[model samples]
Target: GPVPSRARVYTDVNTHRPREYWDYESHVVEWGNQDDYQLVRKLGRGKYSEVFEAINITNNEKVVVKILKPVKKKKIKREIKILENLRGGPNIITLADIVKDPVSRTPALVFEHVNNTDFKQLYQTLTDYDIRFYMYEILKALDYCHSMGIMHRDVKPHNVMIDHEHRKLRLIDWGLAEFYHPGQEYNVRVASRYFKGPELLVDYQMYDYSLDMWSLGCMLASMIFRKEPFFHGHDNYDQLVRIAKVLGTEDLYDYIDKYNIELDPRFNDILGRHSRKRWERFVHSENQHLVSPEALDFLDKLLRYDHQSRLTAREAMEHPYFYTVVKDQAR
Candidate 1:
């Protein structure tokens, strides 16, 4: 089989992972006894699941219950496979069990609970070092998953849980994650619009793990720029335009031409050329303290329009942005 050009870096990403890890269809999930768990309260809801704060009644332990919202069987199986494969990986959420309501025939995924503060509120209180620390923590999760041959299609701040008091972070939400097969054409409609990578909005399907790096870049940009979403697009096509407006339309065209990608016809007019905005353009009185040469350089590497050129999670951790934290922790 021919490999996609962009996937060359990680062509062997899943070589060591078991075939069962990638074959979601063949998976037969071992469902836990639902009677052992009790719903305490609702945590939140996602497109495919309803999350609740749950308790292991017998053990008196807290947990999170994600009840499926009548989605396809394949999605549930894929998520379970990835979560099971990722067990014990750094900062990755641990899945405790799979449960189903016999009456409704609805499946529920049980995961270890994190005492997380609201990300929007928690981010506002972080120091520059805290931002770096937390992002480094996220990178641990990213690197681990990538090593296991899985791409976290959704890598937004909302999917990251921060237990601030203990300085712990857990990456959650495996519903959109998928195993990376060399040269595979995946659905580009995976991530949230604002945090979606260029490959997604531009309809590039042969993207690799670098897609997650782009999402992380958006999260980092918002944290330092003090913008909720660094690029806020109203819809799918607008998402690409939002990114082009800042990263410049010229480089975006180069990416398309290099990959021989075909843009959705809707983008032809909206994609009028743009010059890359200076990193300093985003600096303001509120964000000045967080902006630095190291920070800008880190963002530059991850926010590249070309998915193949974006920093890998491992490389991003080594960038100057995390130098101080790495040194301090080493000491």
Candidate 2:
């Protein structure tokens, strides 16, 4: 039998909120006129939506319009409801408006425009201090959302918008976000391949907000290690292998045993025994500047195989790694 796992903190947050807050499927959305916004340029395309840089005609202000591709109505409502519920939270993307095509009823979400540099280029120029600062800012967003009983399942760098000039960061793309209810078995199919937590890969369903912390750890590891993905898994199953290669196969077995998780049959064919790799081994001449004892300690806490053992977003924020950043921000 498997041991039940819940978030170490804020376990009963949803219980306090009204049913309307988390019952996104039943929420009625008031769709605005799509004509209010004019598309300026295509930003990027995602599996579920095509994003465009747009201008709000009424206010003549810039906005980002995400046109939803045909998907379940419930999903659209979920994203909208989550955005509305988390509106004004620290560093959370602002949902300016919601509109839909009259005839086709193609829904689009409008958001405040962020002057973001491509993360590939932006990361290269970030100083060690800058990494600490921005990561701290993102933690603010994560802690806020988790406290509200919502999990941003997808927390990759691609979903984090950064305006380095203003030192601003916004966690965007709430389509995969969901409310956390204790004892609820959530789909393990969330998060990007590289950012998926061990719980997701091992098919653990009772996971909670700690899932996002693992993604945040991956982002931090990539930024500090100079590895684009840090975990370059060819596929979902391989993703676990990549993680085990670094975190150790034996510890992974212990994790599974504790939770009574049955690994996918595919793992038996592809997985092999591996020893844990030291975090210091990742530091080299090129990235030594970003590597620190505190950073490695913090990363170790978040990348644990046991989901309950991982640092909560709020706990991660208070880590010694951010002591300087937190001190400066207080002034």
Candidate 3:
């Protein structure tokens, strides 16, 4: 049979759903495969998850272990295929290997396990230049990935790993990645709502890697003040306010004018209406000085009132916020 053309593999918008946007990329990393690792304190934990910093038993180096609760066989295998297909570089968190227990079928993905900390812990430490080094690494990692035709739909602080010892920042999540054509758009809304891109939120059918840039901006701001992500609300309803605040104020008004984005007849008046006062308050409340100058700069791009006006990873990398001590993070 002739190799199936790329056209033949159109993503099934319904069933495939491009599932499992967040959570750790891998489930677990086995002991033997990890030749040098002694279990250290957990680096971080989340719902149904815990990541431990371990000693690389052989080399006495450190690594991380992400363990997830037992999941169905199909889901586990699906995530594994995604991991296997991900090509590696500094940006992607490398999957070293996997361990499967024959009796229970519990599988654990062994990782190269870069140690440092995620943006969450680093902010707690309250270190200044370290934050700069960290965000720069993330931007570089993001820039490298975007250039390689990869779009990490979910870009956030936790996804960014920092090696504090070396002050290295690594973009460490790939479960939400998709290969893209330079000018073509991807068609999936895969990620946490707060950091989700505008294209994904507004119209997944016609979106691009710029969503990653949007999320990167939110993550950058969160780290600057060290808090939750930018948006709020139970669902997409509340999550899209900043979309209007920065990128789509005019468009949202158009929607309001045309009654195009109505939520419910009763709430229609409230749906797309934006307020600069609300936006202004949101900006002033956060501790601006604690965050790097770049973060303040990113605030402009990531928090656009309209999704169309957001920044691209390449443009973000060019911003002055990254120039200072950007390369120094690796040192």
Candidate 4:
């Protein structure tokens, strides 16, 4: 067994909190009146929930209705607990109410509506400044959550809602989030394929909040490179292979050796040695506008094979890439 690695920052956050704060299963939810809300249209859906653009008939305000699909009660409780814990934090989604169908016992979470443009359409139009502005806002959410000892297991373009006109951004979807306890081994099957970090791909479970930084790195790389998904792996195993292609197979071996992690045997044929691809190689005529030296350096700090080497959320905000964004806020 390798030596355990904890988060570089906020390593003792959960230790200070009371047992009830992190003990999600023990909390009893007080259900709200479902009749006050009326579904207007379908917003989207995930493996565990169906989302709708709904109206709060009582107050004539719009809201998001996320109806949970049949799953273990503990899973539902975990999401609710995490949302409750993160309420009022910067750029974090506000949970308005929790309701359930009396007859079917189907649970649903109500949240404030965000007028967000789809990332596919929005990223194309975002100027270099726009990227820095929105990314800084996302980092605020990540820092706040990590400060509270929670790891947002899923961090990707899809989970970040942006209202470009209002200059608003929210880090949504706490379903995969979990409170970090020092030396605790978490589920490797957490984040989506494209945003999955090397720790997850290598089957290392003792990861911490730094995992979000890796996912954020994938997102930032995609925006700058104009690649929808920086790493396009067909399956879970190929996910590591795709990452190895850019990060280099030798470094991947070094990372595994440091953590004493054994790669899945299936990778024997697929995983070939690769030289680390220079970041400059991704810059071209189309993406040149978005690429900058500071941006490249920040990306390099984040996409490291060693989880501890990745920048913390707060540290990311202070990076030179966000200097303009931070400077403007002073006024």
Candidate 5:
């Protein structure tokens, strides 16, 4: 499926905000001069962008450079608009500048440097409190964005940058972020498959902010349970089945039924119904340190088969799981 336009069905909030907050077409971009920055090293690549660790030669400052692949002009504009709007929000990555190649007109985004360790190696070393602190920080970013009528459809460990020494965290990758309008049908094809919410997998388009909570739950599940993927689905259809194995198939049917969702026929062959697995089953000698009553309860609320039943970012911040973290911040 092609990456599509930044769709819209503006909420009442959009009526009061500047048009650039919702309209990509009308916003004229003042592209920065690319020559001021020099690429130091390759960082990574995604389906939509190439990333590099770079420096601003003018000020001798480190920064990140994301080179965008040619895509719909609207997609590029939407990301720029959202990042510009969210520049100063809590733990949100700052977009330093935007540039384009003189030859191909390829767009690039410069962002503030974050000293993030590789997640695969870093998460394995975190103490229980480390996960709590980072996740809470991410909620700050999520809540701030949702308050601005944006939903980060993609919320996974990869997008969370943690500078553990300074205890700094940043939420990056706004390419999939979009304006949230009540009753709007967003593209189900946004987030990576493992991080995709139940609503997207079930073909329920009219989902809301609760979608991000589900992704947060998945990431937390992998971290605390010491399972690399937490729910390792072989394919999109199996992804639902994998979740069903833990959350139970009966609830899955109920969720789709409640929403009048017609399950894709591919699910028919593998819809082996299952009983709900207890969260306690995951606790063992290896990951027992991360286990707690509050953590289990908090995760239960977010990993629900029903999106409407998941926690809002504000409500999640107030969860008992973060009680100690919040208390520590006070001191």
Candidate 6:
């Protein structure tokens, strides 16, 4: 008889791994909704489904059981198809096993739980310097994502988790993620309400991966200073004003002129007068007190009104901001 294959264990979210580990199985096997794996309390829950820690009896190792919720059958199928084509990368949620429910069935994507906690925790515990170091790691992971033609629509803090204990950061929740085709993103609306920059909010059909960068700016600001990069409004109308208040109506108009962005005067009137660089000031303010200037520089580029002017993730990584720390763990 052929030798039985030993169990496989995942590490580092598909980043650096030993040569022997190269052939690890991913996005395989079945996860039944009918108590397939032992649920070990709720690790976390989100808009789509609940994530639980479980053990595969067959493999006897741990796995993250992502229980997807019911959406439009077509959309769910669309997402399943989306995930199937998603290329594996270090910073993204890796697909280890996918199971369709036998009864009232939907898909369940089993990912190896990344070693780290989310960015929300890091901001809560670490000092300013460590936060910068951690963000640099996150940026490297994101740069990798865009390189592979992936777009993590929800790039908020809640969507990202870190494992400083093990030195890793990875993005979770690809339900809302979309693929940007060649010249496709040049025209579209994308990203969350709060993280959406002027261009994305005004026009998404022509949007690009730069929307992700804008969200990164918002996320980075929150991680460093624990505040929203722009004002918060309850509705879409208010949210637009919230963005306008910080980035200013003139810059908003500038985007309109460049992107042919059209807006109702009612919303435009709400913009009022403000600073285009308010977010930049928010970081540089005494309140944030972050040790790294490079982080702010990174934010400035993302917050720019012109989508074409926005900094791409890969470009942001190569920028001096991330490279500021000569050593991995700069003091």
C-alpha TM-score for every candidate = 0.96, 0.98, 0.68, 0.98, 0.94, 0.79
For candidate 4, what is the lDDT? 0.92
In terms of lDDT, model 1 sits at 0.88
CA lDDT, every model vs. true structure: 0.88, 0.92, 0.56, 0.92, 0.86, 0.62
Residue 150 CA displacement from its true place in model 5, Å: 0.7
Pairs of residues clashing in candidate 5: none
Task: After superposing candidate 4 on the true structure, give the runs of residues whose Cα lies further than 4 Å from its correct spot.
Answer: none
Better of 3 and 6 by lDDT: 6
Better lDDT candidate (2, 5): 2
Superposing all C-alpha atoms, what RMSD in Å does each candidate have to the true structure? 1.8, 1.1, 7.7, 1.1, 3.6, 10.4
Q: How big is the positional error of residue 320 in model 1, measured in Å on the Cα after superposition?
A: 0.9
RMSD of 3: 7.7
lDDT of 5 by residue, 41-83 (tens): 9998977888999999999999999999888988988889999
Instruction: List candidate 1 segments past 4 Å from native.
Output: 1-3
lDDT of 5: 0.86
Off by over 4 Å in 3: 1-62, 67-88, 118-121, 124-129, 181-189, 225-227, 242-248, 253-267, 276-286, 291-295, 305-308, 326-331
User: lDDT by residue for model 4 over 104-217, one digit each (tens)?
Assistant: 689999999999987788987988999899889999999999999999999998889988778999999999999999989999998899999999888899999999999999
TM-score of candidate 4 to 2 decimals: 0.98
* Candidate 1, 159-219: lDDT as tens digits: 9989988888999998899988876899987888888888888777788888899999999
Clashing pairs in 4: none
Q: For each predicted model, how many residue pairs clash, with residues at least 3 apart or on different chains?
A: 0, 0, 21, 0, 0, 14
Worst 10 residues of 4 by lDDT: 99-108
